[PDB]
Every structure is written in structure tokens, then in C-alpha cells.
Amino acid sequence: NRIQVILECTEHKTSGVPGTSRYITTKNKKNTPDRLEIKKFNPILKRVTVHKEI
Amino acid sequence: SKNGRESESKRLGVKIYGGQAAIAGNIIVRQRGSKHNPGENVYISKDHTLHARVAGVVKFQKKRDNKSYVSIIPF
RNA sequence: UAAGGUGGUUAUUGCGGCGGGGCUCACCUCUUCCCAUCCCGAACAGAGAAGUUAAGCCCGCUUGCGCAGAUGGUACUGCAGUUUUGUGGGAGAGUAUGUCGUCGCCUUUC
RNA sequence: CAGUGGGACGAAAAGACCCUGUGCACCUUUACUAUAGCUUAGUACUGACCUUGGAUAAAUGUUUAUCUGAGGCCUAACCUCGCUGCGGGGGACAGUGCUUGGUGGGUAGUUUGACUGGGGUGGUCGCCUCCAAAAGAGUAACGGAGGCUUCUAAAGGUUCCCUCAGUACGCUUGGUAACCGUGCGUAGAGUGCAAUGGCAUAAGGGAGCUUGACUGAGAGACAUACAGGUCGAUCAGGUACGAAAGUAGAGCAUAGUGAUCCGGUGGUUCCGCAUGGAAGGGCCAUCGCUCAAAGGAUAAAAGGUACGCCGGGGAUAACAGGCUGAUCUCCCCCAAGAGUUCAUAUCGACGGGGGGGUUUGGCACCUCGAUGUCGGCUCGUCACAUCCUGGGGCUGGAGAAGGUCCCAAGGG
RNA sequence: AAAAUCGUAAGAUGAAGUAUAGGGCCUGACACCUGCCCGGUGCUGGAAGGUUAAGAGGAGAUGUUAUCUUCGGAGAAGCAUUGAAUUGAAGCCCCAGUAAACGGCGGCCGUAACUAUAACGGUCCUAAGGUAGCGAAAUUCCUUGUCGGGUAAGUUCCGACCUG
RNA sequence: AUGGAUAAUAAUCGGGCAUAAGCAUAUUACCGAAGCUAUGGAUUUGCAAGUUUGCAAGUGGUAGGGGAGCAUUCUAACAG
RNA sequence: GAAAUAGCUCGUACUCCCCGAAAUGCAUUUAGGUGCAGCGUUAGUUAUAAAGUUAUACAGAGGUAGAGCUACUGAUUGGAUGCGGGGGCUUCACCGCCCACCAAUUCCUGACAAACUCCGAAUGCUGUAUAAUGUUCACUAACAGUGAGGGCUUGGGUGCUAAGGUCCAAGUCCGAGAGGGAAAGAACCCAGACCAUCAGCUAAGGUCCCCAAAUAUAUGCUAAGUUGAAAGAACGAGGUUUGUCU
RNA sequence: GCGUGCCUUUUGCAUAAUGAGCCUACGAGUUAACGCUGCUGGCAAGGAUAAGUACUUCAGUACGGAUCCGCAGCGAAAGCG
RNA sequence: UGAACUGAAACAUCUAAGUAGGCGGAGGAGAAGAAAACAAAAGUGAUUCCGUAAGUAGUGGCGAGCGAACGCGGAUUAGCCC
């Protein structure tokens, strides 16, 4: 049930800045469904941004 | 039979003793659970390992209902 | 001298029982406000000073429960030879016994 | 000198029985990978016309010029027969070449693990906890006990708080084992999951807010054949909680795992074969292996040999020898009884102490460049733990026949 | 122009034969007979339905750029890579047959006058639960089974029983 | 000290044999090895003199490692 | 082809001098082979040198031997209570009773444990300084062999507190080792072989002869040839010497 | 008086584990290419030539700098140094 | 036309190896030989052989292993016919 999720930054890919911020975490496909969203530090933009599960 | 399995030893025990010198990051005691508690200039890690904080001389000084409190006298 | 606050000391410092005390400590009266109960001003928080040592707290006594604990002997054991032993180390348990703490720094007091 | 053959583990054959070698050979199949042959379709040799269907192009549901799927017919390629080029039988079929799917031990190349108180059978192969382990660390057995191939978006972070299990006394259901009230209760609870250690001034439980389960990194140490593994303090950029100090780079800590190659996904003017792109590759993040025989020899793999062969082993078994008695046989010690009464004329349970090495075993110490194995025949020889003959004691011995014990190996 | 056999082929045997003939396989004179099972593996026939090769076919996508776009980017034609719909046989799945084709052919419980047994009844599972015949056997471990004969004495032998 | 059975080719303090030549304690002398020492000699390292000597420590040895050399056949020079 | 391959057996030729091991650990289609580590040789480095070895003084952590359990977990001998349940009589009423066993909790004693600990040594380990010995220590380079071990003493597991059995740990020896003693024995006791000598002193063990040295001294025991090599039982006995009580 | 041949394999052999009837002759770590260590030699921030060519009394001095190693490293790479 | 033993410490891709072997033809030599070639912003100009480049680029169950080319220095030098 425990799957591997990839939280990619959401405010990224909208500005003229090359790159993409991602976080490779684990989750449960039964206990926590519906595309978990978590605030993580974006190393490209140098600020905390909400990353949503792909 | 059904008894032929065992695991490798973790090489626990007591590192630098209570009369020897240590430095800023020397492991003092490796334990499974805090049976040697940290004192002055000595902290504990995630695995209940005792680390030194500054250079000095180790001192155990068991006290308070037979509980070892490892500390470091700076020098 | 007495009390309050705050620390060091592995309960010989603790638990219990019996008497004494209150400028400070504590109960004690209320919930408008600050604050809170998965229900309750019980606890926490605030506003006061009618009463009280009754209790908490502090003193004096108590071997009662706990805690500490010898000297001597014994077990065990390093080295040397051996059926024996000689040289050193030396417990645990138990007995006699001890303990109703001790050491600092601040404020009000005499 | 003539006769018999007990020994020289006598001579002969680098044991043919057993084990072994990532040795060989042959054979088998529902092991792997191929192939001869057989067979299906497409295509070339292979052509002319009618019927029936589909598609494209044009014009106003049909028509006209093509492609294709099928049938029928014709002879003119191609095949066959009879007379010596004809007269018949088929016919664009069959045969053949290339490309393909299925069968195919008919054939060929190979694989088929190790540990092991001989080898098979059974069991195990990686990781974690306790004992063995002899008070630093480490330390083996097919030694004694158990678990793992995970889980939590909260079972993570911070701030503020709370105290367990059990038991006694009371109370409708309710029963002293449900909830409640008052005492006693240093830990006997709980800490997801085995064990050990730890934890109440909590690592156990609750509430509020949150995502540090961040980015760039690693002073110094512990383990250490290597590959790997474990802990960790300062600094910078932005965060969560908290009034602030301060804490937070995942869980109370030890198990929850798989190297390399190859391939996939996201980011990246890093390179990109004359130049500019691209294919592709490189760097960072990450995915795919019960490779479980878990340091994984291939992407891909099972058996028989008494028809066997070669190279070695007493490193290792079967006969015999050797050490020890578990088993075997014999004796002795105590005596509850049985013997009409009376333990020991005779037997003797429940227990104990030894002698012998004749049985079945344990070990694997000499022999696998050979120590010929059961039974019977001939020839004997030795011990006495005596079957007869010989000499005695006791008797539940009237005599004769008995029972038991002692001495005795000359002959049978 | 047989099947089949040898060969790369041509060719040859079969056969200067032709179903009362020629191959493949089992059993083994003669007498009586030769039971049940098509589940599994082989063989034959069918082909409505599913899957399925090469070869045809080319919706769309990608690379390059004439040109247009202040930048970004879009991009006709040509040239190349990659290609999905559609068509596509045998075989396999499927349907039925075949055992003188390979192969297979069961248990428990209760019950009749003294005992014993069960003609009989209940129940579970199969494709079927082994018929006739024989039976201590070239097949039987217990075993030197049990009874009779042979011998003074018979682990061998003969004739019986049936717990094969 | 004594009784508590013994194994098969002829046996055992090693044998003769011993009443101590057995056992227990104490003492003295002696024997006893390639151990130690006395004499002679050779060799390896380290230290000095020189161009061999002196002193100190050594000198069992398998697998294995290092250093100095002998003989054999032939070749180049000088001398036979 | 071809001198196929052989992780296998066998063989491997002159001399002298110096040094000198291992039979262990981790992996392995691996176990009688290898790779790395451990142990060896040669050469070079640390100098106002460093490191080693033994002992002493000081200072540390431990949970073995031992001990104890009313200090937990499990087991456990004997007495005191017996709350309450099972069984006999009395009866309308497992109703009010009367009687003997298994019997909760508590107290007192006796005592067990590798996977029990309220306790807990000796030794061993680590660090500093000192005192003895001086490269024995450590580092680099090159080259190897070994990776079948075994006996004895001690602490253990398994086995039958059996094995010249087997698997570990702390030492020594053989392996690779001559000489002397036990009569002869790879390991037992003494002792580490540069040669030569018709020299002396000793170790273990012995002094009647074989066979070197005491028929030596003092005291007592044994009558069994016990014994003079090693090694024995439960259980008997009016053998003898000797101490105490009686 | 003392003294159980030799070799090989072995924890361990007089071993009754292997091998040899004896003598004479033959018989087993050699060479090439490419490297690494120890000693020695030339040159020295430089060192060395290969194939080849010329002369000559000819299987035996001069020339030949192509090229190789070292002098600067880090990074996958652009690149920096 | 064309193997296998062997190596990969097994083995099938691979190596061994286009080797051994078999068949046919020619000459003192044979083959090749005059660019539908290299190279890269600078250039060379037929083929053959020797030394470097170089154990480099690359290839490979990316395992065992296999392994060029460009450029440079030399021997020789020659171009023509449908």
C-alpha cells in the first residue's frame, strides 16, 4: 500500500527560471489519498513553496 | 534442528575511560539505551551514544541512585 | 533568633506516629475582567483581606517501617608443585551497630 | 636336499565397492537453446476473360478508369502419359527460390549448488535479539530459544500539561473482571510487530499550531580484508513552534534487505565527429531483479548409467584391527516379599557398584599405485565363564533321583 | 508419379508389384474367453467464436528549413526516422469421436437364533471403482501363513483355504 | 596393609632379585645432558683503528627470503 | 589441429654462511583452489627521536566465579491459619444447619536456575608517570609460503562428567627440534645442538648387579613380595601403629 | 658401548603408506616482446632515439628529433589554472 | 568452402579462427594500384612495405577479450588505354 510519491513545486515552472524542484517521499495509497500537498523549501527560488503530489 | 541463527555483534562497550583525554567529537560510550547519562560538556545522540563537546578529561562519577553521569573536565 | 526563596550532597537525607508556631507562607471569599475545564473557578488565571493554624509548611521527640553497616571467619581466585599445599587478593549472606540529616547564597527580622 | 604352505599386511593389475573433479562419454524426458524433416501464408516463375463483395479519384444512391478479397472458365507458360514431333490428362494449380507462424530428443551443444561426524534422505543458506562467551572488544558446532522482507502524513517537529498495571472499601443494571468516588500503589503498565537495554524531573498519554520527513555540507571518532556500515559538533540561505532562551537535517535504540551491467522518467547551450540543429552521450534526482543458493559465475537449463571411463583419496564409508561401553553378558551390595510359619534350601522386585570385550553401536586412528567378503571341508591350538567323567558344602537331602554353590582344563 | 526408406539433388528400393498387394506397431500354436473408464497424454474430424506470424496499408507524431514573426514562436514543399486503425493462414483455446492407442479401475459405519460374518441399508469422493479367471504364485514383507500327503525327522515339493 | 572372578600364542617391578634393595620425614657425599664453565679455532651484525685487528650480542631449523663461491663447454686479450 | 585441458598424482641435479613462519579471519558454483587481511625476508625511514616489552604507584568501566532470592521471573520442602467451592444425615426450601478431603490470601522455615539478580571478587583490559631491556615497535617498496594441524593443562558446549571423539577460548610443545630420564613412546619431566678436546660443575632422575654413582646415616611403619611403573569401586573384617574423648 | 636405510606425502612413517634389480649415457624454471623493484653508469630541466641514409678493410663511424617520458594540476565536460 | 579442443576458472553470445583441413589456377613473385579518396577552414594528391601514432578512439553476456584511423618520418616512384 505504501507508494513512492514525488512532490513537485507548484509555483515553479511559471516564471522564466530553468529547473524544477522535487521531493521524493513515501505515502500510503489507502490511508492518505488525494494528492498530498506539503510546504517545502524550493532551492531554486530560495523560498518555501507548496509542492503537490504528481 | 531449528536453532542455527544468530546476528553479528555490534561491538558495543565503553570507549575512552574516566581518566583519559578526549577531543571535540570523540565517542565516549556506545550503548543500547541511556544507561550512562550525559553530564557536563557531554551530549547524547540518537542511538544513545555519548559524545564529547570540548577537549578535556573524562569522569564518570556514579551518583543519584546508581546512575552514571559521564562528564568532561576541560583542560 | 525565626521565616521565605534558590542550589550542592547516591534515603545515615525517605515513610509513619506524637506535641508546638505564624510580620513574610498557606488555606480562606468572589468570578465583571485576562485565562480554562473533552462537565465542573476541582486545577489554571484574575480581583480581595471576614477568618484561621484546622491542613500544607517549619521545629522537638520516636528504632516503629525503611536505608547504611563493621571486626573476625568462610567461599572463590592469580603464581609455583602436586593426594597433600605455600604465598598474595578477598567476597556475598549474617551479627554487633548507626541514622529522625548536612553544607552555601539572598530578603524581612532578634 | 625332499615335502606343507602360517607370515614377509607375499607377486599381478596407479581398487572395478564409496567419496571426489564447477572431468569425460553415452542414453532419456514434460530441462535450456538451436536445427534436419513436415507443414501454413506472402512473394517470383504466373497468364487472358465472366460473376460476386470492399477502397480510392472525378462527375451529376449509380456511372466511368485502378487496387484488393473469392469463385468459374480458357490455353499459352509449367507438369505428366501413349506412339515416334503429334494424340491425350491436368493447368496458372503443383514443384522450386526468398521471408515467415506451428510442430519436431530424429539430431547437436550444454546445465543440473554447497554445508554435512562417509554420501544420499531430512534440515539450512540473507538480516535482527538473548545464552553458549570464561565481569574490555572479538570468539565455533546439523548447540539451546524466537522474529523480518514492514508500518506512521501522523506513531514526525515545537509549546503547555497529565500519570501508569493492580488492589481494598462503596454503588441500579453490573456479576469485583465494564464506568464512577476515596485510599494504597517507583513502575509489576505502556513504548505497532521477536528479545535485550532504557524511560515517571518520561522515551508513556492529551490539547494548540505546523511540515526540519529543508537546501549546500561534514570538525572528530567507533567498526573495520575490500565493498560497505554507525554516530556526529560548528557555518551559510530560508522556515515551524515558543514571550524568550531554545528545539527541530524523521520515528526510545538495535531487523524490514540486493553490488555491477542494461533500460525508463524529470531537470541541465556540459559534449555533440566540416559548420547549424538533431540522434546519442555525460552530470543530478529517481524507477525496474523472493538475482531467497540473498558478495548476485548466463537474458536463457532437468535426470540415469549394474555398459561405464579417466584423474586422486585411507583428507572419506563397507570387512578386519584400534580407543569407550550406550547396547550385550556375568558377578557383587541392601532386602519389600514369594517360599504352610522362615528374607538369603530356591527365587527375589524397587535401587546401587564393578569385571570381559564374544552382539548391535560411537569415533574415524594404519591400509583405496588392492589388508579377497558369508557358509561348509581338512588341520588344529588356546581360555575357563565346566556339558560328561573326578573331589566336596548346604538343602524345603528318609534311600534312589534332584536343586544350588565351591575346586578342577587330563581326555572326550 | 502409392505410402515408407537412402541422398544436397538426379536417382534407387518398394516393384518390372498394385489392396487376397505393400509399410508402422503389439500379441505369439490350439480350447474358452478378452469386463468398465475418453478425466490426463496421444490420434481423427469439425470450425460458428477468441488469440495469433511475415507481407500489404499509412490516422498521426518527430528532425531539418523557404518564409513570416520587435523577442518568444509558427512553419508550405522536399528529404529521413517512427508509426496506430484495416486485412492476414496454420496452430492453440473450443466441439465430438477413439482404449487389441499410452494409461487407470475407491473407503467408512450399522445390521440375521450361541459365537462369528454380513445377503442388506446409510454416507463421502471419482472417469470408473476392476468382471470372468487364478491366487501364499518366477508376484506374499509378517511367513518356516493354516489344514492334508509324502519322510523316523521336510524353511524345499504337491493339493486345499483367501487376510491378493 | 587385607577380601572383593577372570580371556583366550608364555609370562613380567624392564630382569636378577630384595623383608630392605618397600614406604614416610630429615641430612651429607657422589653419578648424571650437545645445559654452564675451562682451552683451541671459524663465522654474522654493531662500534673504532686502518686498509686485518680489538670489544659487545649472537651462530637448531621445514615452507620460504638474502649473501658469497666451485666445477663443466665455448669465446676475447696477455702469458704458457 | 596438438606440446587440447588437468583447481589432480609423481619428479625437480653443486657447496658454504645469515634470517625464518602458518595450518587463523572474511568472501567464493566455495570447502583438498583461490582473492584480501594475519604471521616471514631484504632494503630504506622517526634523532634535542619515536615506539615496543615486563613490573610498580595512581585512576577508570564491567556483572564471570561466588552468593542470594520475603529483591523480581520461573521452580520448590515442611508447619499455621481455610476466606470460599466439591461430598454424607435433617427436611416443603443447592433454605436455616452439623461434619472429613482437595483447598485463595498472609506469616515462618529449608533451598534451585546458561537464557533470575537487591549484591559481587581474583584476574584480565585501558591511560599517565616511574624503574629495568634497547629496535625487539611503527611506516614505505619488492618477494614469498601458509590458509588439512595435533598432544598436554585450564574454562566450557555436545556426547553416556565415554573415547587417542568433536567444536571454541587462555598458555606451552611437536609441527620445524637435536641431547638426558621414565625399558622401548612426535607432545610427559629436564633442557634450545658453531665446531674440536681421553677437562670440570650441575638440572630432571638416581647410587646392590645388568648399568655411572651410598649394600650411607637418623627415626617409625609394612608381613602383604603389598611394593620396587601407572591405575580401581559399592560393601565386609577381632591385621597392625598412633592422638583425643570415654 | 651406541645405533629400527633413503625419497615423497603427512598432525604424525622403521612402518606392514609410495617408489627404485644394478651400472653407464639422456632427463625437467629457458627464450622473445612489453613492464616493476635493488645495485651500478652517462647526461641532467632536460633525457633518448626508431625506421632509414652515407662512407668503409662490410652479419661489423657519422647522420637521422618522426616520436616517447618528465617539467602543473583540478573537473564527467565546457573550462579554469 | 571451413571445424573442434581451449579461454571465459561452469556455459549457450563471444574467443579459439577465417586458424587447422579440403578444392582450383597463375607467376617469380602474387594481390592491390591512379580517387564517385582523405582532411577541415589550413591543406595532401595512385598502390605496397617499415617505425611511431597506440594498446589511443572505440567495441564487448561492456565479461573473457578484440582493437583502428588521421597526421608524421622513410624504401621505391609511372602512368595510361576503351
- State the virtual CA torsion across B19, B23, B24, B26 in degrees, nearest 10: -80
The answer for B48, left when phi > 0, alpha when psi is -120 to 50, beta otherwise, is: left
Summary count for chain A: helices (H), strands (E): 0, 4
Protein contacts on strand G: list nucleotides below 7 Å from a Cβ.
59-62, 119, 126-127
Residues 18-37 of B with CB under 7 A from strand D: 23-27, 30-35
Asked if residue B62 keeps its beta carbon closer than 7 A to nucleic acid strand G, the reply is: yes
Distances (CA, A) of B71 to A12, B26, B27, B57: 50, 13, 12, 8
C-alpha angle B52/B53/B58, rounded to 5°?
Answer: 45
Q: How far is CA B17 from the centre of its chain?
A: 9
Q: In this structure, are residues B57 and B72 in contact, taking their beta carbons and an 8 Å threshold? A: yes
Experimental structure resolution, Å: 2.8
Name the method of structure determination.
cryo-EM
Tell how far CA A11 is from the center of its chain: 10
Distance B3 CA to G113 C1' (A): 22
C-alpha count within 13 angstroms, C-beta hemisphere, residue B45: 14
The answer to whether some atom of strand G lies closer than 7 Å to the beta carbon of B18 is yes
